[PDB]
Design a protein around this ligand. Structure first.
Ligand SMILES: COc1nccc(-c2c(-c3ccc(F)cc3)ncn2[C@H]2CC[C@H](O)CC2)n1
Ligand SMILES: Fc1ccc(-c2n[nH]cc2-c2ccncc2)cc1
Length: 339
Protein backbone atom coordinates (compact mmCIF):
# COMPACT_ATOMS: atom_id res chain seq x y z
CA UNK A 1 0.00 0.00 0.00
CA UNK A 2 2.02 2.94 -1.37
CA UNK A 3 0.49 5.76 -3.37
CA UNK A 4 1.56 6.58 -6.91
CA UNK A 5 3.95 9.55 -7.08
CA UNK A 6 4.56 11.91 -9.97
CA UNK A 7 7.36 14.43 -10.43
CA UNK A 8 7.51 18.01 -11.52
CA UNK A 9 10.02 20.86 -11.43
CA UNK A 10 8.84 24.15 -9.93
CA UNK A 11 11.17 27.15 -9.64
CA UNK A 12 14.37 25.06 -9.73
CA UNK A 13 12.92 22.68 -7.11
CA UNK A 14 11.81 19.12 -7.91
CA UNK A 15 8.57 18.00 -6.29
CA UNK A 16 7.75 14.29 -6.08
CA UNK A 17 4.30 13.89 -4.52
CA UNK A 18 1.37 11.49 -4.36
CA UNK A 19 -1.22 11.75 -7.17
CA UNK A 20 -3.84 12.88 -4.60
CA UNK A 21 -2.14 16.32 -4.54
CA UNK A 22 -2.86 18.21 -7.77
CA UNK A 23 -2.27 21.66 -9.23
CA UNK A 24 0.90 22.47 -7.31
CA UNK A 25 1.58 26.21 -7.28
CA UNK A 26 4.69 27.74 -5.65
CA UNK A 27 3.95 30.05 -2.73
CA UNK A 28 7.46 30.80 -1.47
CA UNK A 29 10.92 29.47 -0.57
CA UNK A 30 13.53 29.94 2.11
CA UNK A 31 16.68 28.41 3.56
CA UNK A 32 14.80 25.53 5.29
CA UNK A 33 12.22 24.69 2.60
CA UNK A 34 9.79 25.69 -0.11
CA UNK A 35 6.03 25.64 -0.10
CA UNK A 36 3.38 24.93 -2.73
CA UNK A 37 -0.36 25.35 -2.64
CA UNK A 38 -2.15 22.25 -3.98
CA UNK A 39 -5.56 20.61 -4.14
CA UNK A 40 -6.03 17.40 -2.19
CA UNK A 41 -8.42 15.22 -4.21
CA UNK A 42 -8.92 12.76 -1.32
CA UNK A 43 -10.35 15.31 1.09
CA UNK A 44 -11.45 18.06 -1.31
CA UNK A 45 -9.23 20.46 0.70
CA UNK A 46 -6.82 23.13 -0.48
CA UNK A 47 -3.47 22.43 1.16
CA UNK A 48 0.00 23.84 1.57
CA UNK A 49 2.82 21.32 1.01
CA UNK A 50 6.28 22.13 2.39
CA UNK A 51 9.29 20.31 1.02
CA UNK A 52 12.24 20.43 3.41
CA UNK A 53 15.50 21.60 1.97
CA UNK A 54 18.57 19.30 2.41
CA UNK A 55 17.06 17.75 5.55
CA UNK A 56 20.11 15.58 6.32
CA UNK A 57 22.93 17.89 5.16
CA UNK A 58 24.51 17.84 8.60
CA UNK A 59 23.88 16.75 12.18
CA UNK A 60 22.25 20.20 12.72
CA UNK A 61 19.92 19.94 9.69
CA UNK A 62 19.07 16.35 10.63
CA UNK A 63 18.16 17.23 14.23
CA UNK A 64 16.17 20.28 12.93
CA UNK A 65 14.27 18.04 10.53
CA UNK A 66 13.39 15.61 13.33
CA UNK A 67 12.47 18.48 15.63
CA UNK A 68 10.09 19.99 13.09
CA UNK A 69 8.40 16.73 12.27
CA UNK A 70 8.01 15.83 15.96
CA UNK A 71 6.60 19.28 16.77
CA UNK A 72 4.15 19.29 13.82
CA UNK A 73 2.94 15.77 14.62
CA UNK A 74 2.18 16.87 18.18
CA UNK A 75 0.38 20.17 17.53
CA UNK A 76 -3.39 19.61 17.45
CA UNK A 77 -5.06 22.97 18.01
CA UNK A 78 -7.15 25.32 15.90
CA UNK A 79 -4.63 28.21 16.19
CA UNK A 80 -1.44 26.20 15.59
CA UNK A 81 -0.26 24.72 12.27
CA UNK A 82 -0.52 20.96 12.38
CA UNK A 83 -0.28 18.08 9.95
CA UNK A 84 -2.79 16.69 7.51
CA UNK A 85 -0.09 14.46 6.00
CA UNK A 86 3.64 13.78 5.82
CA UNK A 87 5.30 11.74 3.13
CA UNK A 88 8.46 10.78 1.32
CA UNK A 89 8.92 9.33 -2.15
CA UNK A 90 11.70 7.16 -0.69
CA UNK A 91 10.86 3.47 -0.82
CA UNK A 92 13.19 2.66 2.11
CA UNK A 93 15.40 4.17 4.82
CA UNK A 94 18.55 3.75 2.71
CA UNK A 95 17.25 6.06 -0.04
CA UNK A 96 15.39 8.46 2.33
CA UNK A 97 16.43 12.07 1.63
CA UNK A 98 13.23 14.10 1.17
CA UNK A 99 10.43 14.97 3.57
CA UNK A 100 7.16 16.66 2.61
CA UNK A 101 4.77 18.18 5.13
CA UNK A 102 1.12 18.97 4.40
CA UNK A 103 -1.27 21.34 6.22
CA UNK A 104 -4.54 23.24 5.50
CA UNK A 105 -3.89 26.08 3.09
CA UNK A 106 -4.10 29.44 4.84
CA UNK A 107 -2.80 31.65 2.01
CA UNK A 108 -1.68 34.86 3.71
CA UNK A 109 0.30 36.00 6.73
CA UNK A 110 -0.37 38.78 9.21
CA UNK A 111 2.12 41.07 7.53
CA UNK A 112 -0.17 41.04 4.42
CA UNK A 113 -3.09 42.08 6.64
CA UNK A 114 -1.40 45.06 8.39
CA UNK A 115 0.15 46.14 5.04
CA UNK A 116 -3.30 46.31 3.46
CA UNK A 117 -4.42 49.28 5.60
CA UNK A 118 -5.18 49.35 9.35
CA UNK A 119 -7.56 47.09 11.29
CA UNK A 120 -10.63 47.75 13.41
CA UNK A 121 -10.45 47.18 17.18
CA UNK A 122 -12.67 44.10 16.78
CA UNK A 123 -10.18 42.58 14.31
CA UNK A 124 -7.27 43.31 16.64
CA UNK A 125 -9.19 41.64 19.48
CA UNK A 126 -9.91 38.53 17.38
CA UNK A 127 -6.42 38.20 15.90
CA UNK A 128 -4.53 38.70 19.16
CA UNK A 129 -7.02 36.46 20.97
CA UNK A 130 -6.20 33.65 18.54
CA UNK A 131 -2.45 34.13 18.93
CA UNK A 132 -2.78 33.92 22.70
CA UNK A 133 -5.06 30.91 22.54
CA UNK A 134 -2.48 29.15 20.30
CA UNK A 135 0.37 30.26 22.60
CA UNK A 136 -1.40 29.03 25.71
CA UNK A 137 -1.47 25.63 24.07
CA UNK A 138 2.13 25.71 22.87
CA UNK A 139 3.43 26.98 26.21
CA UNK A 140 1.54 24.24 28.11
CA UNK A 141 3.64 21.69 26.17
CA UNK A 142 6.75 23.43 27.55
CA UNK A 143 7.57 24.84 24.11
CA UNK A 144 8.79 28.43 23.51
CA UNK A 145 8.18 29.69 20.00
CA UNK A 146 11.03 32.22 20.14
CA UNK A 147 10.46 33.85 16.75
CA UNK A 148 6.89 35.08 16.74
CA UNK A 149 6.48 37.74 14.11
CA UNK A 150 3.77 38.66 11.59
CA UNK A 151 5.32 36.48 8.83
CA UNK A 152 4.99 33.38 11.16
CA UNK A 153 1.25 33.92 11.63
CA UNK A 154 -0.83 32.36 8.88
CA UNK A 155 -4.27 33.91 8.32
CA UNK A 156 -7.07 32.80 5.93
CA UNK A 157 -9.87 34.89 4.35
CA UNK A 158 -12.09 34.26 7.38
CA UNK A 159 -9.49 35.98 9.61
CA UNK A 160 -8.77 32.63 11.27
CA UNK A 161 -5.18 32.54 12.52
CA UNK A 162 -2.59 29.80 13.02
CA UNK A 163 0.88 30.09 14.51
CA UNK A 164 3.62 28.63 12.33
CA UNK A 165 6.40 27.25 14.62
CA UNK A 166 8.90 27.38 11.67
CA UNK A 167 10.03 29.33 9.67
CA UNK A 168 11.20 28.64 6.09
CA UNK A 169 10.58 41.76 7.97
CA UNK A 170 13.34 41.54 10.66
CA UNK A 171 12.95 39.01 13.48
CA UNK A 172 14.76 41.32 15.91
CA UNK A 173 11.90 43.86 15.77
CA UNK A 174 9.68 41.42 17.69
CA UNK A 175 12.37 39.93 19.95
CA UNK A 176 12.35 40.25 23.74
CA UNK A 177 15.03 42.56 25.16
CA UNK A 178 16.43 39.74 27.36
CA UNK A 179 17.21 37.86 24.10
CA UNK A 180 18.89 40.96 22.61
CA UNK A 181 21.10 40.90 25.74
CA UNK A 182 21.83 37.20 25.11
CA UNK A 183 20.42 35.91 28.38
CA UNK A 184 20.55 32.14 28.30
CA UNK A 185 17.76 31.66 30.85
CA UNK A 186 14.86 33.47 29.18
CA UNK A 187 11.34 32.02 29.66
CA UNK A 188 8.08 31.51 27.77
CA UNK A 189 7.16 35.20 28.20
CA UNK A 190 9.66 36.08 25.44
CA UNK A 191 6.70 35.14 23.19
CA UNK A 192 4.35 37.52 25.09
CA UNK A 193 6.79 40.39 24.38
CA UNK A 194 6.50 39.52 20.66
CA UNK A 195 2.66 39.43 20.87
CA UNK A 196 2.87 42.89 22.50
CA UNK A 197 4.93 44.19 19.55
CA UNK A 198 2.52 42.63 17.05
CA UNK A 199 -0.55 44.05 18.83
CA UNK A 200 0.99 47.55 18.94
CA UNK A 201 1.64 47.35 15.21
CA UNK A 202 -1.92 46.20 14.40
CA UNK A 203 -3.30 49.09 16.44
CA UNK A 204 -1.01 51.84 15.02
CA UNK A 205 0.02 50.54 11.58
CA UNK A 206 3.70 51.07 12.47
CA UNK A 207 6.43 48.76 13.64
CA UNK A 208 6.81 49.51 17.33
CA UNK A 209 10.56 48.95 17.63
CA UNK A 210 12.21 49.03 14.18
CA UNK A 211 15.82 48.59 15.31
CA UNK A 212 18.60 48.61 12.68
CA UNK A 213 20.77 46.22 14.78
CA UNK A 214 20.83 44.64 18.26
CA UNK A 215 22.09 47.77 20.02
CA UNK A 216 19.64 50.09 18.29
CA UNK A 217 16.87 47.56 19.07
CA UNK A 218 17.60 47.71 22.78
CA UNK A 219 17.80 51.54 22.64
CA UNK A 220 14.35 51.75 21.00
CA UNK A 221 12.84 49.43 23.59
CA UNK A 222 14.26 51.25 26.60
CA UNK A 223 13.04 54.58 25.25
CA UNK A 224 9.43 53.39 25.55
CA UNK A 225 9.56 51.20 28.63
CA UNK A 226 12.37 52.99 30.48
CA UNK A 227 15.78 51.79 31.50
CA UNK A 228 15.80 48.92 34.07
CA UNK A 229 15.02 49.63 37.70
CA UNK A 230 16.97 48.26 40.66
CA UNK A 231 15.03 44.98 40.96
CA UNK A 232 15.76 44.05 37.32
CA UNK A 233 19.41 45.23 37.28
CA UNK A 234 20.08 42.81 40.15
CA UNK A 235 19.13 39.87 37.90
CA UNK A 236 21.81 40.67 35.24
CA UNK A 237 24.99 38.59 35.67
CA UNK A 238 26.75 39.93 32.53
CA UNK A 239 29.15 42.74 33.42
CA UNK A 240 29.29 44.00 29.81
CA UNK A 241 25.46 43.90 29.60
CA UNK A 242 25.31 45.90 32.85
CA UNK A 243 28.08 48.32 31.84
CA UNK A 244 26.22 48.93 28.63
CA UNK A 245 22.69 49.29 30.07
CA UNK A 246 23.84 51.37 33.06
CA UNK A 247 26.14 53.54 30.93
CA UNK A 248 23.11 54.61 28.92
CA UNK A 249 21.34 57.85 29.79
CA UNK A 250 18.59 56.87 32.24
CA UNK A 251 15.08 57.02 30.78
CA UNK A 252 11.63 56.96 32.34
CA UNK A 253 8.81 54.68 31.36
CA UNK A 254 6.55 56.51 28.91
CA UNK A 255 2.80 56.92 29.54
CA UNK A 256 1.28 54.19 27.31
CA UNK A 257 -2.09 56.02 27.28
CA UNK A 258 -0.29 58.91 25.49
CA UNK A 259 1.89 56.83 23.12
CA UNK A 260 -1.07 54.72 21.92
CA UNK A 261 -3.68 57.49 22.33
CA UNK A 262 -6.81 56.77 20.26
CA UNK A 263 -6.58 53.01 20.87
CA UNK A 264 -9.11 51.18 23.03
CA UNK A 265 -8.01 51.88 26.63
CA UNK A 266 -8.39 48.12 27.36
CA UNK A 267 -5.92 47.35 24.54
CA UNK A 268 -3.48 49.87 26.01
CA UNK A 269 -3.76 48.28 29.48
CA UNK A 270 -3.05 44.85 27.99
CA UNK A 271 -0.07 46.20 26.02
CA UNK A 272 1.39 47.61 29.21
CA UNK A 273 1.12 44.18 30.79
CA UNK A 274 2.82 42.46 27.85
CA UNK A 275 5.61 44.97 27.29
CA UNK A 276 7.09 44.82 30.81
CA UNK A 277 10.91 44.86 30.71
CA UNK A 278 11.28 42.25 33.51
CA UNK A 279 10.14 38.91 32.05
CA UNK A 280 9.26 37.70 35.54
CA UNK A 281 6.56 40.42 35.66
CA UNK A 282 5.17 39.98 32.14
CA UNK A 283 1.64 38.55 31.83
CA UNK A 284 1.35 34.91 30.68
CA UNK A 285 -0.74 33.70 27.72
CA UNK A 286 -3.34 32.14 30.06
CA UNK A 287 -3.60 35.34 32.10
CA UNK A 288 -3.81 37.46 28.94
CA UNK A 289 -6.75 35.41 27.65
CA UNK A 290 -8.66 36.31 30.81
CA UNK A 291 -8.04 40.06 30.26
CA UNK A 292 -11.14 42.26 29.85
CA UNK A 293 -9.99 43.24 26.33
CA UNK A 294 -11.03 39.75 25.14
CA UNK A 295 -14.43 39.62 26.92
CA UNK A 296 -16.32 39.04 23.64
CA UNK A 297 -14.10 36.03 22.75
CA UNK A 298 -12.78 34.48 25.98
CA UNK A 299 -14.14 31.07 27.01
CA UNK A 300 -12.13 29.21 29.71
CA UNK A 301 -13.84 25.96 28.70
CA UNK A 302 -12.50 26.27 25.15
CA UNK A 303 -8.86 27.33 25.52
CA UNK A 304 -7.26 23.92 25.73
CA UNK A 305 -3.84 22.80 26.79
CA UNK A 306 -1.58 20.32 25.05
CA UNK A 307 -0.79 16.69 25.76
CA UNK A 308 2.61 16.14 27.40
CA UNK A 309 5.39 16.72 24.86
CA UNK A 310 8.58 14.70 25.06
CA UNK A 311 11.57 16.89 24.11
CA UNK A 312 14.22 14.70 25.73
CA UNK A 313 15.70 14.29 22.20
CA UNK A 314 16.89 17.93 22.45
CA UNK A 315 19.65 16.93 24.88
CA UNK A 316 20.84 14.13 22.55
CA UNK A 317 24.03 14.15 20.45
CA UNK A 318 23.36 11.59 17.71
CA UNK A 319 24.79 10.74 14.29
CA UNK A 320 23.12 11.96 11.09
CA UNK A 321 21.97 8.40 10.29
CA UNK A 322 20.41 8.13 13.73
CA UNK A 323 18.43 11.40 13.34
CA UNK A 324 17.49 10.25 9.84
CA UNK A 325 16.25 6.89 11.08
CA UNK A 326 14.20 8.50 13.87
CA UNK A 327 12.69 10.94 11.30
CA UNK A 328 11.91 8.02 9.02
CA UNK A 329 10.16 6.17 11.90
CA UNK A 330 8.08 9.33 12.52
CA UNK A 331 7.08 9.59 8.84
CA UNK A 332 5.93 5.92 8.83
CA UNK A 333 4.03 6.05 12.16
CA UNK A 334 2.03 9.15 11.15
CA UNK A 335 -1.72 8.67 11.46
CA UNK A 336 -3.71 11.45 9.75
CA UNK A 337 -6.44 13.33 11.61
CA UNK A 338 -10.06 12.33 10.98
CA UNK A 339 -11.78 13.97 7.99
C1 LIG B 1 0.64 29.56 1.78
O1 LIG B 1 -0.31 29.00 2.70
C2 LIG B 1 0.15 28.30 3.78
N1 LIG B 1 -0.71 27.70 4.62
C3 LIG B 1 -0.23 27.02 5.68
C4 LIG B 1 1.15 26.95 5.90
C5 LIG B 1 2.03 27.55 5.00
C6 LIG B 1 3.52 27.55 5.28
C7 LIG B 1 4.34 26.53 5.79
C8 LIG B 1 3.97 25.14 6.06
C9 LIG B 1 4.32 24.54 7.26
C10 LIG B 1 3.97 23.22 7.49
C11 LIG B 1 3.32 22.46 6.51
F1 LIG B 1 3.00 21.18 6.81
C12 LIG B 1 3.01 23.05 5.29
C13 LIG B 1 3.34 24.39 5.06
N2 LIG B 1 5.58 27.04 5.95
C14 LIG B 1 5.56 28.33 5.58
N3 LIG B 1 4.31 28.65 5.18
C15 LIG B 1 3.91 30.01 4.72
C16 LIG B 1 4.54 30.30 3.35
C17 LIG B 1 4.22 31.73 2.89
C18 LIG B 1 4.56 32.77 3.95
O2 LIG B 1 4.06 34.06 3.57
C19 LIG B 1 3.90 32.43 5.28
C20 LIG B 1 4.36 31.06 5.73
N4 LIG B 1 1.50 28.24 3.97
F1 LIG C 1 17.88 46.26 29.60
C1 LIG C 1 17.30 45.10 29.99
C2 LIG C 1 16.28 44.55 29.23
C3 LIG C 1 15.68 43.35 29.62
C4 LIG C 1 16.13 42.68 30.76
C5 LIG C 1 15.50 41.43 31.22
N1 LIG C 1 14.15 41.24 31.29
N2 LIG C 1 13.96 39.96 31.83
C6 LIG C 1 15.10 39.32 32.10
C7 LIG C 1 16.13 40.19 31.76
C8 LIG C 1 17.56 39.80 31.89
C9 LIG C 1 18.51 40.27 31.00
C10 LIG C 1 19.84 39.85 31.13
N3 LIG C 1 20.18 38.99 32.10
C11 LIG C 1 19.27 38.49 32.96
C12 LIG C 1 17.93 38.87 32.87
C13 LIG C 1 17.14 43.26 31.53
C14 LIG C 1 17.74 44.45 31.14
Amino acid sequence: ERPTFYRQELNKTIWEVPERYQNLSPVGSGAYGSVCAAFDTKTGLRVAVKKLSRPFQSIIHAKRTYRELRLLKHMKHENVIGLLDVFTPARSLEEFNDVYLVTHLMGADLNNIVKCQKLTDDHVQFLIYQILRGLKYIHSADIIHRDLKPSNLAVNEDCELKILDFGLVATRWYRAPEIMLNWMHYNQTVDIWSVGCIMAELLTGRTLFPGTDHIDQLKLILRLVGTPGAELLKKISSESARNYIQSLTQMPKMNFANVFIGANPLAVDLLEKMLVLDSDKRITAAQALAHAYFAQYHDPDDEPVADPYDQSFESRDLLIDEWKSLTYDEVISFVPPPL
